[PDB]
Write a protein that binds this DNA or RNA. Structure first.
Lengths: 209, 97
RNA sequence: UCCGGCUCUACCUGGCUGGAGGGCAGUGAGAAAAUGUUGUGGUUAGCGGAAAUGGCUUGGGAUGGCCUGCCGUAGACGGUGAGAGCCCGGUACGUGAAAACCCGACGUCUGUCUUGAUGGUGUUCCCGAGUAGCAGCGGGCCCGUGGAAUCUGCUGUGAAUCUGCCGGGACCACCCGGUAAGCCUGAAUACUUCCCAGUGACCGAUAGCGGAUUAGUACCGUGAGGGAAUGGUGAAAAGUACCCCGGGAGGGGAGUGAAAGAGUACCUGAAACCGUGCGCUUACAAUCCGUCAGAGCCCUCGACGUGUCGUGGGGUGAUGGCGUGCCU
RNA sequence: GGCGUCUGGGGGGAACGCGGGGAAGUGAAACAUCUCAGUACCCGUAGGAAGAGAAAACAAAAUGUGAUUCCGUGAGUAGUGG
């Protein structure tokens, strides 16, 4: 197994948490994680890119002039693509880039990411980021400074820890997430991961059975 | 807009940094103010005067209102519920201005 | 549950109809309006909102760099004289509605039940008629008339009321299911002229709406209708006072500006195109216009020795050889 | 029919809806059936949604389901088709 020592904002130690090998000592698959984060960011991408074809452009209904006699090129609409002001032939249209990634692939990428972090000793666990009902970004900053000197941090906490979330929210290199929303992209963008104990055990109890 | 006509200010950004003056004019549509002794342009007129030196406006963000004791301040707003008047104050000393 | 009056008439006994306790619902499809009181319920204005005049340096200017601090439920986005969490609008967060409107809640109020239901026994009546069904012609169903059901329009014909009728893909029997020809019915669903807040591995002025600009304008057409082009000075107009040439335009000095190689013809300012100046070349020559060799001239870089030589580089090109554009 | 009075309508609106009417270019390497397509277009009508809707339904012998609508499948299948 691999043990993570729970910490406290007082620098104390509430105890320890076991990390299962099936979730934290799996071999990482770079190509898998690449595919998974690629799909993530593709789903993030909204295809809000559109253009007008020669049919959607205003006008261009009538032939500008006689087919023959003028010495001009043949035309059928002023909004044809070669025309300035004309339609876009093969241009962006709205499209959804969301890849239909398999669940096992997603989960395995997540586990590989967390396993890399655990092997390199970048997973920390804590009871709570700060004490009760007084969001203190000072306190959270100092605490995370004890836990890690890194810029990029992923804080995994329940949806009910509004106090800790808010306290650690405005920090620049911090990304807050819920364990039920854990993802390869955020875990890999993080240089360190910091669970709350309830959040960690929630991830454990969800991914065990 | 936290800086009014007649208010005394201190320029904090600009060529005239460190200079004080009365806000002679305020342009909220422009978020500018016109202060005595700063942003001194040399205007050409087609007249006696000729190259006459006058004051130009300046962005209100480049000025700070001065405290009672001669220190800059960001400007805050209490509420005088004893008269229902939202009044200005300094962030430094809390005194009205 | 109670009372009263009728219950043809008074008399005993069987139904109805008013009043009263109470339920049951309600502005709903299920009947309909009005009425108030009232919700830190909402929308339609907004307000507050922390933290650097920090030092040094560069700079026209600091929002740059280096170093100091500080806030952070606020490091979102913009602006400000150049990449600003701490200058500004603001943000997180929290507050705020007199009035109107919309959601509620409470009730007045309205309706209904309230003389009521309960559970049983055997015959007659009823259970949606020009309907169903049938035929003819058609439509549409996966089904293009096919063996063609179901559904459906028109025209004719035209029944049965429950042991009745319809459907179960011709049809018949059995069985099953259902109970047409009468009505209503929210939600899940589709859409966005318009309004608000936001986002973009969307365009960024020949793009993106036709329309960043006078835009459905100018303009064209009798008309329906068609349908453009036109963005950027600068940080701030500080938009060049004044003198000189000039009729003016335009310019030169001077000035502003950090910069006028930013002068309302203005950011950068390519090419085609047009010039001017310098070098070389060319007026006995037959030229896909160049290539290869190359005289001479000019320039340049090095060396030595002092101008000839080189591991040279370039521009020109006398002259000779070769040489029939690109695309389709 | 006339007179009077009262209540209402009339027209507009980008899209969506319901009911009706209903092409042709095209494709079939021709073309008429067929397709395009019940599209475009038109008409009449609305409502904020509409329509449909409470079985004269499905089903198949399962003690079956139990209004309607919509989505996905069933399935480009069964079938239909010069």
């Amino acid at each position: 197994t691999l043990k993570v020592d729970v910490k406290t904002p007082a620098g104390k130690t509430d105890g320890s948490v076991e990390l299962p090998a099936e979730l934290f000592d799996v071999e990482p698959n770079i190509a898998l994680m690449h595919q998974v984060v690629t799909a993530q960011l593709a789903a993030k991408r909204q295809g809000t890119h559109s253009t007008k074809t020669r049919g959607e452009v205003s006008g261009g209904g009538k032939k500008p002039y006689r087919q023959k006699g003028t010495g001009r090129a043949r035309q059928g609409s002023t909004r044809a693509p070669q025309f300035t002001g004309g339609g876009t032939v093969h241009g962006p249209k709205p499209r959804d880039y969301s890849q239909r990634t398999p669940k096992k692939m997603i989960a395995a990428a997540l586990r590989g990411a967390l396993s890399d972090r655990a092997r390199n000793d970048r997973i920390h666990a804590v009871t709570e980021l700060v004490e009760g009902q007084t969001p203190s970004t000072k306190s959270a900053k100092t605490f995370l400074g004890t836990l890690t000197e890194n810029k990029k941090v992923l804080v995994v906490i329940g949806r009910t820890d509004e106090v800790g979330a808010k306290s650690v929210r405005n920090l620049p290199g911090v990304h807050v997430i819920s364990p039920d929303q854990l993802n390869t992209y955020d875990v890999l963008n993080a240089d360190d991961v910091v669970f709350s104990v309830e959040a960690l055990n929630a991830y454990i109890s969800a991914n065990s059975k | 807009m936290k800086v009014h006509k007649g208010d005394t200010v201190l320029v904090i950004s600009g060529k005239d940094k460190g200079a004080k003056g009365k806000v002679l004019v305020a342009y909220p549509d422009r978020n500018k103010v016109l202060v005595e002794g700063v942003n001194r342009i040399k205007k050409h007129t087609a007249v006696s005067g000729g190259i006459v030196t006058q004051e130009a406006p300046i962005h209100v963000s480049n000025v700070m209102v001065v405290d009672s004791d001669g220190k800059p301040t960001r400007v805050g707003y209490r509420i005088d519920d004893e008269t229902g008047k939202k009044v200005r104050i300094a962030k430094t000393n809390g005194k009205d201005i």
